[PDB]
RNA sequence: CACCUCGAUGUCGGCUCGUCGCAUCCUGGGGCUGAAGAAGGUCCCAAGGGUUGGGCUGUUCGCCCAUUAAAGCGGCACGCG
RNA sequence: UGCGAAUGCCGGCAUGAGUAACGAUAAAGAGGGUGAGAAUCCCUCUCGCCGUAAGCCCAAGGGUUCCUACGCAAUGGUCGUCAGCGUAGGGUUAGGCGGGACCUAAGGUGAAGCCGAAAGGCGUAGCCGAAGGGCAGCCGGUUAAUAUUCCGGCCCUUCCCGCAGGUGCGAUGGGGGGACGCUCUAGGCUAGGGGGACCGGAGCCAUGGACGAGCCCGGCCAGAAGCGCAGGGUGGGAGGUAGGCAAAUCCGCCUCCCAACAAGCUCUGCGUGGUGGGGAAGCCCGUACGGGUGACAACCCCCCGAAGCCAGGGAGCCAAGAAAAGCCUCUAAGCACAACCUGCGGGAACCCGUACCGCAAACCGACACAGGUGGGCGGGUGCAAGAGCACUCAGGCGCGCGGGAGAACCCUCGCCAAGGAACUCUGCAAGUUGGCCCCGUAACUUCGGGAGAAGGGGUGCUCCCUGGGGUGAUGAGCCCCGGGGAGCCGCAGUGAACAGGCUCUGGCGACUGUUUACCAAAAACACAGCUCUCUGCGAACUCGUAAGAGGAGGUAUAGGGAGCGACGCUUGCCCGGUGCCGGAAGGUCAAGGGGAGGGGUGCAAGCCCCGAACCGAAGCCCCGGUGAACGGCGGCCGUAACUAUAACGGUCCUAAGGUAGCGAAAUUCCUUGUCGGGUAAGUUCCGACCUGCACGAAAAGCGUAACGACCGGAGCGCUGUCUCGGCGAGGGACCCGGUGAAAUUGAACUGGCCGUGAAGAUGCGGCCUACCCGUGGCAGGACGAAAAGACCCCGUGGAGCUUUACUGC
RNA sequence: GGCGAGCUAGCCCUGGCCAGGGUGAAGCUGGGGUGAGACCCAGUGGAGGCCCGAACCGGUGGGGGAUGCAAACCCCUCGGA
RNA sequence: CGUGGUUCGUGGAGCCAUGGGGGAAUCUGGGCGGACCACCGCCUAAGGCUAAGUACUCCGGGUGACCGAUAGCGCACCAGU
RNA sequence: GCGGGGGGAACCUGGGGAACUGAAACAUCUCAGUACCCAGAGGAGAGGAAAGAGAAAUCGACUCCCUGAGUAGCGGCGAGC
RNA sequence: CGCGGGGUGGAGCAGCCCGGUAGCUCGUCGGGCUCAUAACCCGAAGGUCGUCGGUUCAAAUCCGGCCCCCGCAACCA
RNA sequence: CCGAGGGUAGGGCCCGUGACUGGGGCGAAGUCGUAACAAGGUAGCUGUACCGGAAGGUGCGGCUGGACACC
RNA sequence: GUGGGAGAGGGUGGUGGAAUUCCCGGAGUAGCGGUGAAAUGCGCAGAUACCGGGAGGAACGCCGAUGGCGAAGGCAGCCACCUGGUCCACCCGUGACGCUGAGGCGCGAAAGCGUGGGGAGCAAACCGGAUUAGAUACCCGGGUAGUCCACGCCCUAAACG
């Protein structure tokens, strides 16, 4: 857990790096499974559509398997546990017995010697994947399909998990990491357990630079702008928000709920407060 | 100190070049105008 | 007040450099004194010269330290970019 | 159709004025030559200046500027016989260097598709795209001028055709590889450099000494196969096989068998290599330039040693480090006479670039402009090191006006008696200090720091002894790092150049960072960190009419918005208003449904027109919540057995009346508050108190080590800051020869005073003073120049900004 | 309606650059310690928006320039490195 | 219903056009004559083509109470230089 | 196999479509369906043979000129059209 | 100088604004309860409405002036 | 050479003193309230934590040195 | 040593039901709550009381004692794992090997503290209702931290027999 540092410099005093002892690999990854990728936070027309992104470290994109249901029944050996820098989480390398190699996001409690399967068959054990309809109520669970065959969208972030509260008809009831309560179709795969590298949330960036490395450029407050620039800017000598606090674009950033109202998705949501 | 003309022969031709101008209706009408005005050179030099 | 100047008359203070006025701070000459002497007071003559260094403050001013014969007040576009 | 005005327009020519300047203070002097003519061109000598450059090479960019002949009108800040200038001729040679008949990257374009009033926008595959990947040439000689291009020598690549030997061949398809970070870094090499008593070499003994194991010059370069050293990559066999969108013998995966090692296989580097080639000083002529001998040159030992090579080397770390082709391998059709593989041999091998400048007089800066411009190499000695600094190689240059004088004054610099901040807004500026080694080093602290704290001692040369290291042998020599002893000289030994002044104490900001290109670098921005808030994923949000995209190939430990801003200890009360959040009732509510009743017109059947009740969203009202949401957090009167003061009470109002902390403050008007400290003297500063005009808790409150080209206050050290100036140097200023601007300018024959006048007169009145004209100087005046005042108002002038202004989108 | 990111700001792809010195993190090894530890010390090690300081990037203070060498320069000084 | 055109700006607002919803008939059928109804008239929508009379002046020519090199085109001249 | 593509001073039709300005402020209105941009057309282009006018039992496709007429109207019944 | 509010029994507030009427809480006084005091119960007293003029029939109330009080403002300069 | 000591520089400890500040002792009859001693009228005490003019109050846990009627 | 024994002794992982609160659905009507008595609060927007469903946290009723365990603080539903102390019977082994214990080290209720979680009920602070002269209290309605878990600190006590 979380290497610390003596203060031989300012900012070496609070910095905190991950315990990598979990990582069995280093400089990989399985060259058959990864392309590359790029961006700027700019979009097809050239324009910043997400503010304060850029620079930071080059990355190769580990391709990872969010469909477990196309290998139904083939088993797999956990071959390695290694460092994906596109995600909070860790990715286990697994060899199937096909000889097919695949990345999965690596559950908490997953040692690398072990066997993993997916399908209705499927022992309920860390790493396996099943239709939600075959997973016993109360199981914590991660990498959950939202809709059948469409891939896992739910609880992939380091430390996350979700939980089966019960069943209704074709649907089972999940408590997402958000606490929202949600019905997901029985047929959606999910892998059993929690995501792990749960210690993630406690790293301490420690210096401005550690943010730059991650591609996070400085973030300048409305308060520090002029009125051309932002609903709060001017007066100066500071200024209170002078108005209900606002985005650059004028909408209100305290309390104001932006989920669209008529989304047919609401029939399947019961919660989150 | 550094100044505003930093000649680069490629940039001249991909920016003000003839195929630039033709690629775009703004630029075809630049050629239309330059021609109808009787410009000797419709479009910049670069070697 | 709103007369010249808004097709521009640069504004405080400092410094430099002065020059002039006298309603005189000192020195010179005087009357009165509730002037014994000394030392003051107040007023008259008198512009020749003189009129310190320093702490504080942008300061002018002022307060203060140490001296002084005395540490004068004013004008000169609040003299002088 | 008549011009005097428009800071009018166009042109011409004046004034200023022979004035300022002539563009780095690196610096010149003479002799000879040339010529009509020479400070300025040529050659010689002497002097001086660059030398991590002011030398050499490359890429941009520039485009004949290159070389040579003939020229000097202009261009050249003077001159010019000279030139980057005029005229004219000449000059750029590649299968291997660069780029294309190769690959892909961002991006671009784009069959398919998608979207858009039109123009067009997007987009998979593909295509295009390079300073990245792939790819075969090294050394010398040659021209006035080009050379990895021509030539000499020694190598190599592809394609085509043949022959031989080998083999299931075969691709746009599968697989391997290519293929990768940042720090640090091993071993062996080379580049490069130093030294030699050894090798080779014209020549020299001057001026006192020196004929020497003297002095000065040089002592290498390239080189296939083979080989040797140093490294890189690298298992072999079988069986199974369901994966690698067909196929596979390949790759993947499982099991068994032997290798563990580079053993082998293989690739590269270096070295050596047949051979080829250079080869100094000097002296002689003879050169923009270089050319003979020296020479038959010598051609070797030692050491220093990369950042370069071996190269996919190794280690550690986290922020986790391109693609695709060449290349190999696998099979599909298809063909197995073919095809491919290997070696040899003959043939074939296109296009463009190539001159010259290239830190600049040839590029960007209107200029031969003190500016700007990416990669490489950049020698020697000494100073700890080093690309630093001084001198210096090669090489390059004295900056395209000069000569004199030796005033003021200005700039840049040197020194100063006594004093030592008295200077001044401020020690601004300058001075001090200054490198290295050693002693030594406080508060406080987040235990790292603070620290180079502070403060000191050492620092040269000679002789003696002496310890370990690298290289060699375990040897010497050569280098490296030391240690001890005894002496020498001077004012002084980091003897010159480069190289912190320090201390105390406040405010602000945690810290390194960021900023107003070109008056603000900061207490501003950012920043790790904390909190609120939105967002279940075709996410929220952003751009776009849309398609599409960003978000994100992310998924609540994530992503968006907002505030606060390391850390410590903390962040109180008010929900009445506003905002947001929740509320299936109620009220009002638009189109629409409704059609009671009324109307126009028809002979009428009808056609047409109104139209009440009632049903009918969101929003608003209403109900509640909500503070790290916008925000807000009282007044008057009385009271104690001196006095004062008021723990205490009364009352009025509020949604609630400011808690902790802090406080004359980056906030205190009165104000230089009062007291204390510092000083001889303190409107600042520091410590207090509290009467807080008008602090106060995430537009955070109070602190806080460390940090700061921030802002304040004090001391020591030290000084030309000052008392208070003096002297000296140089570049100007002055004089002479050459060249020769500028703003401004109604015209001028252009005095002072006291008046006067639109109120500040050279110009009017009176009086005074005053021969004509210049030079060098100073700035009082011409309400001096400059800029149609920026402040101020005016205009029903403009623009940016805000909002519960209006009205729209 | 068009022309501009050859200046400048941001990002994207691909390369390159950062003399020399200093200080001495974790880790590792050994020793000591303990019931086993934590931990202590030594060596090694070579971390860091670490320190001094060229190249490079700057632009702090002051002087100079002000019809400039220059429509932002020069000199001394200074920040990062 | 929402708009455009017409002189028509919502007006008593017809006509012509039509983005949206509903949605006929073939002469006894349909549009129109300024809301609407009656009468009286006009005309035959939802397919298409059609000279001439009209616009213009790169070009050629003819003519000026048009200019004469600061005029006349920007260009009398190798100027869109 | 035939055709398309692109250009042309101005002129033509179509799709789109401003602001200054005017209203002595300014929103409706004006400038103006102008400027402009886009597509197509030609030597012209558009229009064109009545589901028309509109009070006459009248006219007879369309274009262009004069006139009707600054009339009928329109209009913050304002400017104006 | 300026603009807005205020001055009412002893204290703090209503009442003015809309003419005629002065009210609420505390205090003070008389009486109870208590051994006693407060607390508590029953009772009373108490103001010309800053002041000076006017209007009216009548003025705390409407108007003017003066005297104070609280507040706001004083900017470009 | 050592060397009294003088000088310069930086530490340590100790006494004294200082605007102001903190509580404390003590001083016949001042002000506020009633915490405690009787079940002291809320049993008290208590470590600690928050709050409040003040005594104190409340929370959590603890101690007894506290407890003939009522469901 | 052997053979036995009782036990909420400690650490870990599980797990059970009762109840409270919250939500959904049913049915149902005008009050419910609360107190000394009341008010605040909740309720026709359909509460309270009743039934069904779900969520979640915390504490373990009867057994239970005047009891057992532990050195102390302390320990109480049930299951398992791991683990301490201790008692009895035997009279087997070693042979004074003992007792205490300044320092040291370790444990240490509650509250508090840091970092994550969790958060039902309760409840400092706080708000409101009442009481009172006042009532920053006692009672009533609310209510955050906390109470719970992991890890790490704090090191106190009427830590008492
Ligand atoms: N030891 C002093 C401590 O602190 C306080 O003591 C101080 C005060 O509380 C106490 O003051 C008392 C007061 O309570 C009492 N109710 C009124 C009385 N007059 C006062 O008394 C004081 O005042 C007068 C002066 O007037 C002195 O003469 C007299 O000595 C002294 N007692 O007097 C003490 C000082 O003298 C507490 N009483 C208590 O904690 C303890 O006694
Ligand atoms: Mg684009
Ligand atoms: Mg970087
Ligand atoms: Mg920010
Ligand atoms: Mg700003
Ligand atoms: Mg903008
Ligand atoms: Mg705005
Ligand atoms: Mg604001
Ligand atoms: Mg402000
Ligand atoms: Mg630069
Ligand atoms: Mg031509
Ligand atoms: Mg006037
Ligand atoms: Mg007048
Ligand atoms: Mg003026
Ligand atoms: Mg003038
Ligand atoms: Mg002037
Ligand atoms: Mg006199
Ligand atoms: Mg006398
Ligand atoms: Mg005199
Ligand atoms: Mg001062
Ligand atoms: Mg004063
Ligand atoms: Mg003056
Ligand atoms: Mg001046
Ligand atoms: Mg005329
Ligand atoms: Mg005239
Ligand atoms: Mg002159
Ligand atoms: Mg001159
Ligand atoms: Mg010169
Ligand atoms: Mg010169
Ligand atoms: Mg030199
Ligand atoms: Mg050198
Ligand atoms: Mg070129
Ligand atoms: Mg030449
Ligand atoms: Mg000349
Ligand atoms: Mg020439
Ligand atoms: Mg190509
Ligand atoms: Mg070819
Ligand atoms: Mg390609
Ligand atoms: Mg495109
Ligand atoms: Mg390339
Ligand atoms: Mg290349
Ligand atoms: Mg090549
Ligand atoms: Mg060569
Ligand atoms: Mg060449
Ligand atoms: Mg094959
Ligand atoms: Mg491949
Ligand atoms: Mg001799
Ligand atoms: Mg010599
Ligand atoms: Mg040698
Ligand atoms: Mg060789
Ligand atoms: Mg020879
Ligand atoms: Mg490696
Ligand atoms: Mg340069
Ligand atoms: Mg260079
Ligand atoms: Mg040159
Ligand atoms: Mg020159
Ligand atoms: Mg230059
Ligand atoms: Mg450079
Ligand atoms: Mg050195
Ligand atoms: Mg140098
Ligand atoms: Mg001196
Ligand atoms: Mg001194
Ligand atoms: Mg200074
Ligand atoms: Mg020095
Ligand atoms: Mg020192
Ligand atoms: Mg010597
Ligand atoms: Mg230094
Ligand atoms: Mg201050
Ligand atoms: Mg800072
Ligand atoms: Mg830095
Ligand atoms: Mg800023
Ligand atoms: Mg600036
Ligand atoms: Mg700075
Ligand atoms: Mg997407
Ligand atoms: Mg993506
Ligand atoms: Mg801030
Ligand atoms: Mg702050
Ligand atoms: Mg707050
Ligand atoms: Mg509120
Ligand atoms: Mg509310
Ligand atoms: Mg509200
Ligand atoms: Mg309703
Ligand atoms: Mg509604
Ligand atoms: Mg409300
Ligand atoms: Mg409070
Ligand atoms: Mg104060
Ligand atoms: Mg003070
Ligand atoms: Mg204040
Ligand atoms: Mg102070
Ligand atoms: Mg503040
Ligand atoms: Mg706040
Ligand atoms: Mg502070
Ligand atoms: Mg501080
Ligand atoms: Mg800084
Ligand atoms: Mg600073
Ligand atoms: Mg001087
Ligand atoms: Mg001189
Ligand atoms: Mg005269
Ligand atoms: Mg006069
Ligand atoms: Mg006259
Ligand atoms: Mg003169
Ligand atoms: Mg003058
Ligand atoms: Mg002068
Ligand atoms: Mg003007
Ligand atoms: Mg107006
Ligand atoms: Mg206006
Ligand atoms: Mg650019
Ligand atoms: Mg750019
Ligand atoms: Mg370099
Ligand atoms: Mg270094
Ligand atoms: Mg080092
Ligand atoms: Mg280091
Ligand atoms: Mg650094
Ligand atoms: Mg500077
Ligand atoms: Mg600056
Ligand atoms: Mg540095
Ligand atoms: Mg219309
Ligand atoms: Mg109409
Ligand atoms: Mg009909
Ligand atoms: Mg019709
Ligand atoms: Mg009709
Ligand atoms: Mg009609
Ligand atoms: Mg008709
Ligand atoms: Mg004529
Ligand atoms: Mg003529
Ligand atoms: Mg002309
Ligand atoms: Mg003429
Ligand atoms: Mg002309
Ligand atoms: Mg055409
Ligand atoms: Mg049109
Ligand atoms: Mg107008
Ligand atoms: Mg206007
Ligand atoms: Mg036609
Ligand atoms: Mg036609
Ligand atoms: Mg037609
Ligand atoms: Mg019109
Ligand atoms: Mg009355
Ligand atoms: Mg001694
Ligand atoms: Mg001594
Ligand atoms: Mg009591
Ligand atoms: Mg009590
Ligand atoms: Mg009690
Ligand atoms: Mg309380
Ligand atoms: Mg047990
Ligand atoms: Mg046991
Ligand atoms: Mg025995
Ligand atoms: Mg404890
Ligand atoms: Mg606890
Ligand atoms: Mg409660
Ligand atoms: Mg006990």
Numbering used by the authors:
A (entry chain 11): 2 to 274
B (entry chain P8): 1 to 47
Reproduce, without paraphrasing, sentences from the article in which this PDB structure was first reported.
In this work as in our previous studies, we employed the full Thermus thermophilus 70S ribosome co-crystallized with long synthetic mRNAs and natural tRNAs. We determined six X-ray structures of the 70S ribosome programmed by 30-nucleotide-long mRNAs with AUG codon and E. coli tRNAfMet in the P-site and the A-site occupied by tRNALysSUU bound to its cognate codon AAA or AAG, or near-cognate stop codon UAA and isoleucine codon AUA. To discriminate against pyrimidine-ending codons AAC and AAU encoding asparagine, the E. coli tRNALysUUU contains one of the most complex modifications 5-methylaminomethyl-2-thiouridine (S, mnm5s2U) at the wobble anticodon position 34. Another prominent feature of E. coli tRNALysSUU is N6-threonylcarbamoyladenosine (t6A) at the 37th position of its anticodon loop.
Thus, we determined structures of complexes 3 and 4 where the SUU anticodon of tRNALysSUU formed a U·U mismatch either with the first or the second codon position. Two additional structures of the near-cognate complexes 3 and 4 solved in the presence of antibiotic paromomycin, which stimulates miscoding, supported our previous conclusion of the antibiotic mechanism of action. In both cases, paromomycin stabilized A1492 and A1493 in the ‘out' from the interior of helix 44 positions, hence stimulating A-minor groove interactions with the first two nucleotides of the A-codon.
